[PDB]
Ligand binder design. Sequence first.
Ligand code: ZN
Lengths: 1096, 49, 49
Amino acid sequence: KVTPIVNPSSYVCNVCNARFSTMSALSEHLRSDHRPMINNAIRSFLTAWDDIRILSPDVSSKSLSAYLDSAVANGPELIIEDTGLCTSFMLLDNIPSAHLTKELIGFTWFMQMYQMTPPLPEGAVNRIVCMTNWASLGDEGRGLEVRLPPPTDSSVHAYKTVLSRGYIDNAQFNPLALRSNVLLMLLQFTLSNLKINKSSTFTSDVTTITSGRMIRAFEGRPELLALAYPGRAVLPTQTKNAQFLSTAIADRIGRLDRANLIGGEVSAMVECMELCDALTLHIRETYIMLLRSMHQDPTQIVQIVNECANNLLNSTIPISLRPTILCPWFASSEDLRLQQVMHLVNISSNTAAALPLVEALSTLLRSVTPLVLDPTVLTNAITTISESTTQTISPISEILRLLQPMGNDYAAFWKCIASWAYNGLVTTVLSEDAFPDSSQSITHLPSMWKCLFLTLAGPMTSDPHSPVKVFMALANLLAQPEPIAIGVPGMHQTTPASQFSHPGVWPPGFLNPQLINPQQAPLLRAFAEHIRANWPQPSEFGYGSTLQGSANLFIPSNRMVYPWPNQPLPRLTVAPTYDSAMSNWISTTIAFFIRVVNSVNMTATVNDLTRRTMTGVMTAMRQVKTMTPFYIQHMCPTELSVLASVTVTPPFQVPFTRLVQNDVITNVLVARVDPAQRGDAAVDIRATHATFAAALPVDPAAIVVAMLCGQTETNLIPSHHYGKAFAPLFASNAMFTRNQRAVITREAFVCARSAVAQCQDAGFLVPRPLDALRQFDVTSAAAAEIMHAVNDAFKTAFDLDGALLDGLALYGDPRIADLSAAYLQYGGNVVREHVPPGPSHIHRALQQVESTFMAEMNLFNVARGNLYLVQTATNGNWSPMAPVAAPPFVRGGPNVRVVGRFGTIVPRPNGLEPQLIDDGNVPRDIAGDWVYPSDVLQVSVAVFRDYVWPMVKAGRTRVLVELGHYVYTLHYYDPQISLDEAPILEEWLSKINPAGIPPVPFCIPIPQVYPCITARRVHYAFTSENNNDSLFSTNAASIDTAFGENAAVSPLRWPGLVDPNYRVGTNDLPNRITLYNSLYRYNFTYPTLDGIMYVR
Amino acid sequence: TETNLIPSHHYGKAFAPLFASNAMFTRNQRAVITREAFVCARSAVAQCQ
Amino acid sequence: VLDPTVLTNAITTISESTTQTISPISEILRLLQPMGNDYAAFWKCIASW
Ligand SMILES: [Zn+2]
């Protein structure tokens, strides 16, 4: 059938044959027929339901925080431009004058009569309503917006954004969570409005209206050209707009100073005057000021890329001029720290998080390395030692059994290297199944060669208890010949060398080898002499660039500690040398186990000819010319300096420790909550912070193959081989993605911990401009909805996909959001290097919006001041929003009475009037002046409507409704027709719950153009404070308003258009908002790294 | 606790069925009967001995 | 209301619960076992005061 063109005028219920004029009437009556205990959950499911809103503070996604390599790899949208004009307030016409009942020729004049669109609205009520981006034709709008309906509508769905869905129904707003809902709208006002002002095109005004002024050329959209420029209005008749637009100064339009640089090239920054509020323009200019803060000039970003690549990459920049080159990619060193902790807060602090993170290096580490493992060399070094085959036990064959993995299993060496950048999260542990057991002796031959493989692979693994496990695995293995004293009791010498993972059970002989007697244990003192002398020195090196900064927390910035005494990278042909600390470590173990093999204990048991075989194997193993001693000292610290800034996470390091008892890093700790707000400032740091329990069981048999048998191509130039391998992973700007992440991680963190502490009472040191507003629910789960919604907005406005700000509610109390980090040493070093947020920009922007919200609350459909309910039966002008008289009966005045907490009428017998309990718990009579608090009237509303509200209609009492700030809904009527406000105002009383109130129905007459006869009418509701701050013009198309107020267009809104004393560049911004300002548009080109530099 | 909790409205909505019950009033009526049944029974075993 | 999911999200991240890890963890997995009569041992312990 044919599709319908118009909605049905009558809606059917089909249950009962009931006609409905409105679908909203059918929406309630179908809901009415659904309604014991069963129908209440059915009615509430249709009551508090809506999913059409963007923000979901009530949907608490449990453990959504999960770090991903692709989550940071998507950068946030920062460069969103605004080709249109940057105002947030459209001049909305509520009541056109065509809706006026009496119409005579010539009283009202329309521009539509002359085939022309008006610059200013033309009706009988013109409000200034907050509708963001109504004129913004910029590319790819910010997602979230706020679009308030005019005051004739309900205008409460913009104020149910948090703490309001399940608690109050649709027709109400929650006044005890009002400061939350208003401020979260202002965040939605700000982040919807973080655009870049872009100059479109500028033609000369060829026509006679301004005669040559460089007009904004809205080419394809003339319906916005007339609205951009009120100065180019045609003023045919004496419209009341034409009364105002006659005062428009002629040269306040178009561009003034095009700051161009290069002839032919697009200009840098024009300076034009057009229609814009003073508030959006402040949000735009602080966004460029944000966007310059991560900009660096191209002479300095080539120093960053070369220092990030350690100056072995061929990146050249042209030396010339480049006009418009915003390349915004540079978070400071402070902001990278704030993301790095936020990286560690999102993750699970077990081994489920570092184990993705190590192989992120180790995949790229094996991709670029020149070190080619080839285990044939150490095989050919051992199988070419001579052994008589007549023996029962072969020391050649019984150690290649303990040497070969079946697969490759050689990337575990490269995971062992890649864990050095991540020793804060994970500590690689010697694999417990590779320790020799506490059953076999030193005469048992494969048990000894395990202890060689542990001692060689000792300094590779980053566990702080590695050398005590190396020392004990031999001290276990010769407990019968050489006994010593082992620490506290319960840990004996035959404890199987894996349970010595605590610093308290290091033996005293290992700390001081003088405590081991050479006359008792000569072979075991010399192994304590071995480890304390030859264990490598924990050196350090730099990475990244000092200009960019780094996400180091405990290491000083742009540095990395390293468990080996490194040397800089050579650029000539390299050869395996024995000057390394590796070769110092390797040769002295073999020099120690040639002593153990040729000791007295092995002499009595092991045959002398097969003892020469073991000596011959290790001396062959010592003389294997392998490149890994040169590699770990020279070539490997270069690529751990390079890959530390191209992997998705910067290295989180904790300083290494060579055998110091008091400097063993027992725990590495990061908290989500500072110990000052909760009373935990003096307790142990393990109770205040969360700890990273991660470990990797590195197999030592695969390390010794990798360590003692590793070679490289003969003609290797290590600058060339690193310069060729690192080139595909610096050509893109994707390296700078985490800098764009870290600022948005900052700007969301500062603004969320503000928005929580704004809604608390005196939380962190944040300024509180909205503290006049009502906020009662300050609990954890209330503030959990606030931070989750701010998180829901920064993930929407910058439309990213990572996990920022999640996991700050892991413990469940985001009222205390402070990021700290620490590590405890066994001596009791309690470092606590905690990181505050940086000097953010959007937190300065929201703070300015909140300050200028308070001066113009009425502009956002929120009235301030109390509420008056007196019977005012008048005939003339009636202005509830602007009470021209003095506000009667202020609180505490002459015999004005304040109701106590219950709102309790006591009944009196035998014709006596019912008394009302006041604040002093005294029943006082109804007739008189009363003040009701808002919360008393929320629970006494049936007692109000039945006992003291009919006393208001009789005019014998007057009730003040004391409440701070409130959403108002205006109602209009033809004043020629009679009206009584009580059917309009009892509908307000009929929906006041104990949970929330509806917006307040003020009745206002439409201002008439004729001096017409007016009906006597009775009004009840009006306000005390002047709340008429959103009325733009009382009546526009008419020549003159007659009956209503003569509220013409205020020139205070427009200094930039009508004031001769207006200087370019001024605003009264904490006060009222100027709607026509001078500004700056931009023409930034957005180069890639190919547009900056050239990389071969 | 509840994500929208006011301790004044919740305790009023919770204690409201509790005061409609006459357990405050049955407690006093069973106590005055027990005492009258105590004294009549304390002396009924004391007069027989 | 008594909902352990704030604890349970905070405690399942830092736990491991693998076959080489059950022997320390298994006492507090019994804590996380959600089979309970809406935590009657708590409110019975208040009511005994
Ligand atoms: Zn029906």
